[PDB]
Every structure is written in C-alpha cells, then in structure tokens.
Amino acid sequence: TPWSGYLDDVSAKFDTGVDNLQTQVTEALDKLAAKPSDPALLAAYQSKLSEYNLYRNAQSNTVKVFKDIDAAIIQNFR
Amino acid sequence: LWIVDLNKSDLERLGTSWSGSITIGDKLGVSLNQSSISTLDGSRFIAAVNA
C-alpha cells in the first residue's frame, strides 16, 4: 500500500538479493564475542564482514548514479 | 509585573531483583530471569538491591 519510488525499487533489489546476510553478520558477531580467539570464528567473521562492506557500497553508489540521470532530464523541461 | 514559581517533589525506590543459573550433570541447564546464554559452571545468582 505505501508508495515506493523507482529508486526504492533499485535499492530493494539488493536487499532481496542478499537473502540472509543481515542476520548472518549479527549472529557471527555474537558467536565471535563469546570466544574472541578461535581460528574458525575469526575466519568466518572476516568473510561475512567483507561481504557486508561490499554490499553497502554497491547499493549506495548505484542509487546515486540513477539520481543524476534523472535530474539531468528534468532540467531540460524548463 | 510579578512572576512566581513554586515546586515540591518526593521520591522513593526500594527493593531487590534476582536472577541466576544452575548447571546439573553438565547435561541440563536451568536459568532464572536471564535474557542471555550462560556459562555452565552454574550455581550463580545475583540480588540487585536498591534503596
């Protein structure tokens, strides 16, 4: 029912793309915090935190580019 | 012009909260009012007193 724009669609595609990563990173961080030195927990966490960093970067840069493609057209109506 | 402000207040807090845990046989864990996983040496309680 609520209104969602084109940029919301573009953004949402990533969220529904990375199905579970948001929960995986949280639980992997709690499992690490319980034993801050265990080679398997460190090796798991390094992966999940890296995947998260890349996900948030690609999402925000894409939305920025589309915003500029639109503003460049609206300017010509004048 | 006269402006007047008057204020009174009284406050009291008193009592305790309890929580803790026990491990038996290392095979059954029991815990009391804990929102978190426990280290299973057990026999560990806390009484937080305020007055």
């Binding site: 029912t1 929960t23 639980e27 | 996983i37």
Partner: protein, 51 residues
C-alpha cells in the same frame, strides 16, 4: 520425498453508503509467525491488503 499441501482463505468486506454517493473502503493487515529456535529470536510476516 513426498509432500502435500492444502490452503483456504475467506474474506468479507462490508461497507455502508447512501444512494448516488460514492464511497471507498481500504484496509491492510500484517500476520506474523514465530521462527524455530526462539533463542535465535526472529519473525516472519506478510501483509494482506484490499481496497
């Protein structure tokens, strides 16, 4: 592996209007389900809506 499923859903909207007067009714609601392993606190939900 063998599996079977059956589902059934009945909905009634009811609206009061005067003659010749246009009217609208609009609603939506969310239903939640408790995921397994409640220590792993999570929910799932969906929204149904009709106008």
């Amino acid at each position: 592996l063998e599996e079977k499923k059956q589902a059934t859903v009945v909905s009634r909207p009811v609206l009061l209007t005067q003659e010749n007067v246009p009217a609208i009714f609009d609603n939506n609601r969310t239903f939640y389900t408790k995921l397994i392993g409640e220590r792993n606190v999570a929910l799932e939900h969906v929204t149904y809506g009709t106008m």
